[PDB]
């Protein structure tokens, strides 16, 4: 009889323990594994894949195939924005239902850089330039090209290479950012503007669509697992 | 330089001049069963060039009102020659695939197609009764099926249809179609490329399975951007699939399987 | 190990174009922030340890609530024993986490939490109860009564739990007949043949085995008290030593049955303007 | 379990009444099964007074509405329009015999074990 | 959509008979909620089997039940003259619809 | 037959000790020592070698 003392925390069930346990089926011959292609060892291998963003969540456009498409036009030059994003990779209604957003809804803290890739789906004869900008927070959100020129921006020329990637750098006052829509540790503002305009010749469609993609970089991390608000069960 | 390719398998040859690239799904080329992973004990038959060749399915037409198309493998190649005969004669079958999608248009056209290769592409039914879709509707063959714009419930309890009702933004399975890019994929954008090539290895939880009971891969073609041409009244361009099996082997030889069709 | 460090980068004017890409080829552009903006040297000490698949599946989840009663068998037909067929698909959270992937292979640890309650305490009192949890593999006989011969457990594994104890915990190995579990099965159990009748050859779409992992049988060992006592045992399921093999998009609509079907809960995204932040 | 009356009229709506005990009203589900003469049994629907949820058969979905009354422990069934095939004997049944098999993973399934004496309705001029 | 039963089964006293009930998938062939009911003329239906092989209290032991695929069978061993009447098959369909059988008249010869 | 290994150094001895008490491997605790990763089979599943500075279509 070895003298022992029972510490507090005895006879509890913690859901996240790592204790050993007896086996109900001893001496079982486990079927040996095979080399199935595509083995996933980390969730951040899946967040580094481009997935489409439901950018156009207008009431006639949402929950249809039209919500992934933003319509560009042949009309004259203006400094009004084409799209606007609030950079909350979860709890923005556009970004939270991407695969990056669905992985990040299982976590409370995120850190790292993001890649935004926009694909041009017009004709070959269609030619134009675009300004894709990122504004770090603490200021008024840019409603014109003159305001968003001062931030981090990429000028994209439409040509043979049909898509361009803007890398949002990790500019933050904290080591990790919170998943929910907290005003503290907010992400920034992302918008797209016309630099010059899209011009087409005759016998060409004057309206063309753009498709946006989101993915994480190699410096991306999450650190505290949680439940999601995207699933529910009745009764 | 990169934009030209020549594929050859068996007696068939595909040449393209406006290719993007070729995607090998999950970085794995198709291969035969190694001796360390072989579950059946009988000698496999390997038809080689009799089965590993490019078969061309029926041509579907892309227009403005079209919402998508889908196919099942190896169900789409069940009537395609000696591959279909070796599938129907044998109990077990394993094949990798090279899927080539062809869709050409002029430089004044616009549009984009998403070519998605889905392992275990399950589709939802049309009724309240769960898992009630029959074999004849879940295996249409070379004609495939079509994605629909909205969900419609079958109220006929006397003679139910027992069919799929795949909604294209729900991808036929209740997942958002923007997140379908985690599958191995290529995009046919008409200003960029006229073809898509996917090389699919054998992906299953078994080394070999019954091909007549089980579909390993599903190919989904969805218009990511709609077709438009010159602001005129109507336009219609064709889409052609060409699928080649790779590394075929079959084990359990018995009499012919004639499935019920109605 | 730590993530790769941010190398310092100056201004660039060259033929190299890392920003231009083509997503028609099916690849992600592998860009870092030094390819687009000027960066400083940052030594990164962050790790991806919590984002592993083992840490993702490290938490247990409730899969069943099995209800048993202790009562005299002569009145009102109380549930003296109850049988539950083992599946994960009736609770949505662990089902969604598993249906992130197609194929999986893990050991599993079970945990059973038992609570008891009095229907009416004015009828008397009752003693401490002992609960028997019997595993029924597929093919083993099912009990028909609470005092049947099948509860002797000559070959079936059984766990006896005294009320008030710490919760009962066992582990099982990988018990699948394949080389991995299949979360999705695009197929049928049997193929209908030509010439046979319409009642023959039908099967469910995606069922595979109808009884794949068996059932759990729960009863109260003790005899009947004058008071009716109800009891709920909650099954908590924790995967460990996890390997997964094919990533899938997560489910965006409410689940409807064991398959991929949907009836309601559609149109999930809310209204948000295009040019409003 | 008691049935209200026995009636006859073509065309117009006929209301049914079934009164049970107060324990069985709040705990168990109440089912409606009809029986044409020599033609076997036919399920019509379910009223569950603990949560006031209704499930109807697809043959009787548009015509049959079921209500509940907690003050008298009585459930009601109304057929909004009647045809000549609806000449049948209508039973009121209480589902209180349970199954050992757990319905889904959280609920209990009950079979019918207590049946009322019935109600005969004739649809003829 | 109703379940299939034979119209009439006949037998002498002392013999062993079997009444068969064939349904479909999403039915008997999927669930274990298969039950049997007995109806004498003028009476309410009485439950004689509630789960697949299980009997309620008070039902005589000569009744038995089994299931093989999409078919459930009720077997009466040692038939008596008091068993004359109708036998009804009952099961649960997966769309939460409860459905009966056609009914089998038993005649004791 | 004890196994000694290093734990996490967050807010921080360095080592911890684990002994397997049961015969079968399903009884063992989660080791959580895996840090293998290769996203290139999902992010670049292309037969040709991708160079980020080059044009992707050439
Ligand atoms: C004394 C009780 C013993 C309990 C025995 C449990 C039997 C093994 C259960 C394995 C469940 C597997 C669930 C996931 C499989 C899948 O992904 O299809």
Author numbering:
A (entry chain 3): 1 to 235
B (entry chain 2): 10 to 271
C (entry chain 1): 25 to 301
D (entry chain H): 24 to 148
E (entry chain L): 21 to 129
F (entry chain 4): 2 to 13, 24 to 69
Quote from the publication.
To make complexes, 9H2 antibody fragments (Fab) were generated and purified from the mAb and incubated in excess with virus capsids of wild-type PV1 and 2 (WTPV1, WTPV2), Sabin PV3 (SPV3), and Sabin inactivated PV1, 2, and 3 (SIPV1, SIPV2, SIPV3). A Fab model was calculated by submitting the 9H2 amino acid sequence to the SabPred AbodyBuilder38. This 9H2 model initiated the build that was guided by the presence of disulfide bond density visible in the WTPV2, SPV3, SIPV1, and SIPV2 complex maps. Strong pocket factor density, equal in magnitude to capsid density was observed in both inactivated and live types 2 and 3 virus-Fab complexes; however, there was no PF density resolved at any contour level in either the inactivated or live type 1 virus-Fab complexes. In inactivated PV2 complexed with Fab, the loop has continuous density and residues Arg100 and Ala101 were assessed as contacts. VP1 residues 96 to 103 are disordered in the WTPV2 and SPV3 complexes in contrast to the inactivated complexes of the same serotype. For types 1 and 2, the live wild-type virus superimposed with inactivated Sabin with a Cα-RMSD of 0.3 and 0.3, respectively. Inactivated virus footprints are not significantly different than the corresponding live serotype although we cannot assess the contact details completely within the disordered VP1 loop 96–103. For each inactive virus footprint, the most similar contacts are found in the corresponding live virus. This finding suggests that the inactive virus particle would have similar immunogenicity and could generate cross-neutralizing antibodies as a live vaccine. Affinity measurements were done using biolayer interferometry (BLI) with biotinylated virus (Sabin serotype 1 and 3, and Sabin inactivated serotype 2) immobilized on the probe.
In support of this goal, we map the epitope of human monoclonal antibody 9H2 which is able to neutralize the three serotypes of poliovirus. Here, we solved the high-resolution structures of 9H2 fragments of antibody binding (Fab) complexed with live and inactivated poliovirus serotypes 1, 2, and 3 capsids. For each of the Fab-virus complexes, we find that the binding site overlaps with the poliovirus receptor (PVR) binding site and maps across and into a depression in the capsid called the canyon. Thus, 9H2 outcompetes the receptor to neutralize poliovirus.
